[PDB]
Amino acid sequence: SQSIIAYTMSLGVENSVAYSNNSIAIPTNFTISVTTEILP
Amino acid sequence: VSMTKTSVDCTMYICGDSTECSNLLLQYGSFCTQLNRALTGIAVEQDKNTQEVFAQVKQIYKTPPIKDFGGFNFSQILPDPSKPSKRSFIEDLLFNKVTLADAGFIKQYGDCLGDIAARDLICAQKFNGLTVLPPLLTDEMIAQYTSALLAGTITSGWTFGAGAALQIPFAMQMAYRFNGIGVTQNVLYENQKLIANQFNSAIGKIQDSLSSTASALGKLQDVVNQNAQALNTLVKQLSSNFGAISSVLNDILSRLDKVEAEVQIDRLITGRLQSLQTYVTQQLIRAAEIRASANLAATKMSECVLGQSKRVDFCGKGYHLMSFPQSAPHGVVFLHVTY
Amino acid sequence: IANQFNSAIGKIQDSLSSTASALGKLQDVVNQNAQALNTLVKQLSSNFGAISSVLNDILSRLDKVEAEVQIDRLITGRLQSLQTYVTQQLIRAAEIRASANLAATKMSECVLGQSKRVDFCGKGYHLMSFPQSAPHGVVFLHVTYVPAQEKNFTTAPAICHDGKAHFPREGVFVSNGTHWFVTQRNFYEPQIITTDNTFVSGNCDVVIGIVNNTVYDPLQPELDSFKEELDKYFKNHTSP
Amino acid sequence: TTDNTFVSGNCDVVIGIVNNTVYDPLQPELDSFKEELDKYFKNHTSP
Ligand SMILES: *[C@@H]1O[C@H](CO)[C@@H](O[C@@H]2O[C@H](CO)[C@@H](O[C@H]3O[C@H](CO)[C@@H](O)[C@H](O)[C@@H]3O)[C@H](O)[C@H]2NC(C)=O)[C@H](O)[C@H]1NC(C)=O
Ligand SMILES: *[C@@H]1O[C@H](CO)[C@@H](O[C@@H]2O[C@H](CO)[C@@H](O[C@H]3O[C@H](CO)[C@@H](O)[C@H](O)[C@@H]3O)[C@H](O)[C@H]2NC(C)=O)[C@H](O)[C@H]1NC(C)=O
Ligand SMILES: *[C@@H]1O[C@H](CO)[C@@H](O[C@@H]2O[C@H](CO)[C@@H](O[C@H]3O[C@H](CO)[C@@H](O)[C@H](O)[C@@H]3O)[C@H](O)[C@H]2NC(C)=O)[C@H](O)[C@H]1NC(C)=O
Ligand SMILES: *[C@@H]1O[C@H](CO[C@@H]2O[C@@H](C)[C@@H](O)[C@@H](O)[C@@H]2O)[C@@H](O[C@@H]2O[C@H](CO)[C@@H](O)[C@H](O)[C@H]2NC(C)=O)[C@H](O)[C@H]1NC(C)=O
Ligand SMILES: *[C@@H]1O[C@H](CO)[C@@H](O[C@@H]2O[C@H](CO)[C@@H](O)[C@H](O)[C@H]2NC(C)=O)[C@H](O)[C@H]1NC(C)=O
Ligand SMILES: *[C@@H]1O[C@H](CO)[C@@H](O[C@@H]2O[C@H](CO)[C@@H](O)[C@H](O)[C@H]2NC(C)=O)[C@H](O)[C@H]1NC(C)=O
Ligand SMILES: *[C@@H]1O[C@H](CO)[C@@H](O)[C@H](O)[C@H]1NC(C)=O
Ligand SMILES: *[C@@H]1O[C@H](CO)[C@@H](O)[C@H](O)[C@H]1NC(C)=O
Ligand SMILES: *[C@@H]1O[C@H](CO)[C@@H](O)[C@H](O)[C@H]1NC(C)=O
């Protein structure tokens, strides 16, 4: 039941930003994230 | 950002449809696999360059249907729905400046069956084993990523670079930007209609410039022209004798027997293999310039679009407020906005 | 903040211990030099049109002057094989210089400093980075503040209080819907709108979208406490 | 003003310093309370 599929690739998940002339989003909290970057 | 992907079939270039030439070409060992491998390396690097430049958002932002950006008129750099390939008005002006020379799309052999085939070099390149290949991202997908970078910028400022997109009113985003250049935020609000008019007028001059002059996209047409010229030069080396009795492989094989022919075919193999190793050296060195330009373009995408840069003259000449990316054939255009 | 950093360094152990592909940028550089030397060795086995690839078989079977024509083809084909290998290695070495100059720039701007450059020192607002050695390379563990749990608020570019228009000195105005506050832009921490949080310029006619709210002046209760003190003391001093 | 500026040291060390007044916004806010306070004693002296 496994097979090779072929598809148009998704660029990313879709998102309409909730913009308005008088609305702001402000973070009530933060995440400290550590991310690895590797260079020759 | 990128250059045309090419792949060259070493046997079809060197020995075009002769087996008794192919049996000599085998005596040179790995060189045809080195040439294929090197060109495949360059070809994959062109998609990587385009991914590093445009795919900096993993999320596809939509602009709101209302356009209350405080008087700033992005309608000339946001998408136009009314045309099938979903690019913005300035991206259509950019797309018309750079005349491509193939993109790999479906050159289905019956085009190369006529007077059309005689007037163009694309059929001659194809028949001599030189093939252009298509980019992984279509110009639709570059326009979508560019639309998402721009819609993120006008609805959420720098915040979609660092984390989740946080909405902010556009005239308040410009206030954060004015404080960023050391100008106090009341200087925006007390002049907001003038700042919007000067921005709207400056975007107007970008259209008038791009619509009038033939030369504005010269850096991209130079890259297209160098790729096309290196393929045309490689095709024309198939007319050199290299000291053989004829340049045409089948003339040697019809006019000489198996012993004296192999002395002549070996010269054509030597000269043609030297012509491919020249072309692939030029292309590997070129690819390093196109990469260096792509890594700069990705660095301007990160520091001028996804942020505001304190780096003097990095994001256009002036104090940097913000930048808008636009797609172009094999490139990116940044519209840098400066106080 | 310490627990989150310690937990995120925990995910670095687990990810590097679990997956094979994470060091692909370094393993690919080792694979290219290994493949280029393997190719240069395999290429010795070619004839280049000589009667053998093995130089000693030519010299075992041919005399001093018929051998030269066979040996010279092997010379020509092997010399072309080195000129190819060395050209490939010079072009690659330019990609390794560019990577080493980027790594030196990231050492200077992400380890020896803190970078205002977006996405240069990892995805987020850069706090600091830690270098780690790797075979033929460097790993940077970039530490970033990422804003996490947002709330919407109503907002205004200015507050109007006394015909005068007020702007934040640092931060942004917000309302929960009933009250107005000023907050630092990248972390919700609301404060009463005061003459210490704000500055005045112009009047409320010019700012598009200004809103009316009171502005507290913390000198007033220090003068009003000092006023009711005085009024009671005058009432007392009318009594004797 | 004392809100737009900060103090450090005295007029001798800074090459090219100039004399001008520096307004203090605390001063009229207490001098208005002073002439009113003198009026309040004047009312209390009146009967
Ligand atoms: C918007 O934010 C305001 C400040 O956080 C908030 O106002 C505050 O509301 C609480 C009740 O939820 C009041 O709490 C006090 O209520 C009485 C006062 O006599 C006491 O019995 C309680 O112990 C407590 O101290 C606050 O006094 C009030 N603050 C002000 C300045 O009025 C609003 O409720 C928030 N609005 C929304 C829509 O969330
Ligand atoms: C913010 O607060 C202001 C002060 O309370 C308030 O200003 C006042 O607005 C009213 C209504 O526009 C004006 O009313 C008078 O206007 C003319 C005469 O000039 C007449 O047509 C009206 O009948 C009426 O007499 C006040 O003159 C005006 N006062 C001042 C000092 O400007 C704003 O309206 C408030 N704005 C918001 C959005 O809350
Ligand atoms: C800036 O303001 C300063 C204060 O007004 C002023 O300093 C004063 O300058 C006068 C004139 O040079 C000096 O005059 C006295 O000097 C000696 C005694 O100390 C005598 O020989 C003189 O007859 C006279 O009495 C003051 O000594 C001096 N006072 C102080 C506190 O330094 C500056 O001159 C002003 N400078 C400018 C350029 O405006
Ligand atoms: C911030 O607000 C937006 C949109 O505004 C609100 O829309 C209603 C939900 C209502 O509360 C109104 O009074 C507000 O003005 C929120 O966007 C919605 O998000 C949900 C998924 O979370 C989605 O189903 C809706 O279709 C979205 N609506 C729009 C117009 O985009 C958003 O969720 C709020 N942000 C946060 C952090 O809660
Ligand atoms: C901010 O987010 C952190 C998580 O990063 C929250 O911490 C967690 O709090 C819950 C209880 O509320 C616990 O179950 C988790 O174990 C906590 N995790 C850690 C790492 O401590 C924190 O509560 C949030 N703070 C605010 C003010 O919302
Ligand atoms: C934003 O800019 C566009 C293009 O400059 C404006 O579009 C023009 O609008 C007038 C008035 O409706 C039309 O007569 C023109 O034909 C439009 N031109 C184009 C190219 O569409 C648009 O009006 C501006 N938007 C706002 C809100 O001012
Ligand atoms: C926001 O948009 C609405 C609808 O156009 C408008 O009525 C309102 O006045 C605008 N607010 C500001 C602050 O301009
Ligand atoms: C009332 O005023 C007198 C001075 O006239 C003062 O000595 C006394 O302590 C005051 N009493 C009170 C209760 O303030
Ligand atoms: C500035 O230059 C002028 C001469 O043009 C000189 O008189 C004056 O003393 C100088 N002032 C300072 C503070 O150097």
Residue numbers in the entry:
A (entry chain C): 689 to 728
B (entry chain A): 729 to 1067
C (entry chain C): 923 to 1162
D (entry chain A): 1116 to 1162
Recite the paper's sentences.
SARS-CoV-2 is an enveloped positive-stranded RNA virus that depends on fusion of viral and target cell membranes to enter a host cell. The RBD can adopt two distinct conformations: “up” for a receptor-accessible state and “down” for a receptor-inaccessible state. We have previously identified two structural elements, the FPPR (fusion peptide proximal region) and the 630 loop, which appear to modulate the S protein stability as well as the RBD conformation and thus the receptor accessibility. In this study, we have characterized the full-length S proteins from the B.1.1.7 and B.1.351 variants and determined their structures by cryo–electron microscopy (cryo-EM), providing a structural basis for understanding the molecular mechanisms of the enhanced infectivity of B.1.1.7 and the immune evasion of B.1.351.
3D classification identified five distinct classes for the B.1.1.7 S trimer—representing one closed prefusion conformation, three one-RBD-up conformations, and one two-RBD-up conformation—and two different classes for the B.1.351 trimer, representing a closed conformation and a one-RBD-up conformation. The two classes for the B.1.351 S trimer represent the closed prefusion and one-RBD-up states, respectively. In the B.1.351 virus, the S protein largely retains the structure of the G614 trimer with almost identical biochemical stability. Three mutations—K417N, E484K, and N501Y—at the ACE2 binding site do not produce any major structural rearrangements. The most notable differences are in the NTD, which contains three point mutations [L18F(Leu18→Phe), D80A (Asp80→Ala), and D215G (Asp215→Gly)] and a three-residue deletion (L242del, A243del, and L244del). The L18F and D80A changes lead to reconfiguration of the N-terminal segment despite the disulfide between Cys15 and Cys136 that partly anchors the N-terminal peptide. This replacement causes a shift of the nearby loop (residues 144 to 155) and must also reconfigure the adjacent disordered loop (residues 246 to 260), both of which form part of the NTD neutralizing epitopes. The triple-residue deletion rearranges the 172-to-188 segment with a movement up to 17 Å (Leu180). The accompanying mutations in the NTD remodel the antigenic surface and greatly reduce the potency of neutralizing antibodies against NTD-1 epitopes.
